Amino acid sequence: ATGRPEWIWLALGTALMGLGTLYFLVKGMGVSDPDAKKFYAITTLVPAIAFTMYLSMLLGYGLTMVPFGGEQNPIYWARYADWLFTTPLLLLDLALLVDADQGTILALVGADGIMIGTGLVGALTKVYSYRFVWWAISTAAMLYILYVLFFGFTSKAESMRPEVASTFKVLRNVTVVLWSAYPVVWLIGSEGAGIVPLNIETLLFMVLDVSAKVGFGLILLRSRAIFGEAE
Ligand SMILES: CCCCCCCC/C=C/CCCCCCCC(=O)OC[C@H](O)CO
Ligand SMILES: CCCCCCCC/C=C\CCCCCCCC(=O)OC[C@H](O)CO
Ligand SMILES: CCCCCCCC/C=C\CCCCCCCC(=O)OC[C@H](O)CO
Ligand SMILES: CCCCCCCC/C=C\CCCCCCCC(=O)OC[C@H](O)CO
Ligand SMILES: *C\C=C(C)/C=C/C=C(C)/C=C/C1=C(C)CCCC1(C)C
């Protein structure tokens, strides 16, 4: 599996997601607060899922060849199986933090599923020009998600416990910056215009994935906002 130059970044991402999973797992031992237990369960599952998908890419299972532009292009499809389950869980962490209504949550998860789903179709589309149609629809779904997090949650977090509002605003800022980089990497990477080579693209996604899953988890699980206000 070492014939692919990007293997070094897949192995490092695999290791980092594995160590993050174990850290959150041990850290969650003994926590009895029901509210904190919810956040630990959601947040520990995120790197655990990504660990299995990074391992599958390292071993070569999560890779396929897609013909477009007159060439057989290597497409790591396992990323979308990862994101299909981890991006909803990350949104749920934010929504539960601000106690969002059930209707708003369904809208976020539904739009998230469309965003990843259309991204997958664009990744496997064989007509080159059609790949960017799916990219545009996926990006429009992400912009809807970002809009809700700003003009829907922020207005309700400010009316909550101060520790909750401060942690949400930090995680919301982190989320907006990191998530917005994904469509850009896709567009200029091997899946899109092919300006950046695959080995560099893999490096970019690895830094983003670890930050958005482990880094995001470190900020949340160290806050007092996940525990109920008790004496
Ligand atoms: C916090 C501690 C960790 C901090 C570390 C964060 C590093 C992330 C930086 C990445 C971009 C890497 C850019 C490397 C560019 C090499 C490209 C190259 O030389 O070939 C390109 C090819 O010719 C086509 O133009
Ligand atoms: C080298 C290590 C590689 C990386 C590790 C391999 C990951 C795959 C294995 C196991 C799933 C274990 C459980 C995952 C679910 C975590 C949920 C949790 O622990 O939540 C605690 C909550 O407080 C309770 O009520
Ligand atoms: C709260 C919700 C929790 C959700 C927990 C779910 C986590 C499942 C994780 C991983 C395995 C992913 C395996 C995906 C199966 C792909 C197999 C396939 O279709 O391969 C086709 C063909 O054989 C080859 O290209
Ligand atoms: C809308 C309400 C919520 C506001 C939230 C603010 C965050 C906005 C950020 C990003 C969208 C992603 C933009 C990605 C489009 C990049 C395409 C591009 O410009 O590429 C040019 C050229 O092809 C290469 O040199
Ligand atoms: C696991 C970490 C996070 C933050 C994953 C986020 C992924 C996305 C925001 C992906 C977006 C895409 C779009 C909108 C357009 C191209 C296809 C993608 C699925 C990469």
Residue numbers in the entry: 4 to 234
Please quote the paper that reports this structure:
The primary function of bR is that of a light-driven proton pump, where trans to cis isomerization of a covalently bound retinal chromophore starts a series of conformational changes necessary for directional transport against a concentration gradient. Structurally, bR shares the seven trans-membrane α-helical topologies typical for other rhodopsins, as well as G protein-coupled receptors. The primary reaction from the bR dark state to the K-intermediate is the isomerization of retinal from the all-trans conformation to a twisted 13-cis conformation that stores a significant part of the initial photoenergy. Here, we investigate the effects of increasing laser power density on the light-driven proton pump bacteriorhodopsin with a focus on the K-intermediate that accumulates just after the excited retinal chromophore returns to the electronic ground state.
From these data, we observe the characteristic negative to positive density pairs corresponding to the move of retinal C20, as anticipated for the K-intermediate. Nevertheless, the positive differences around water 402 are also amplified, in agreement with the movement of water 402 in the nanosecond laser-derived K-intermediate at the lowest laser power density. The overall structures are very similar in the temporal range from 6 ps to 16 ns where the K-intermediate of bR is dominant, as indicated by their low root mean square deviations (rmsd). On the purely structural level, our results show that even at the highest laser power densities, the overall conformation of the K-intermediate remained basically unchanged compared to structures obtained using nanosecond laser excitation and freeze-trapping experiments.
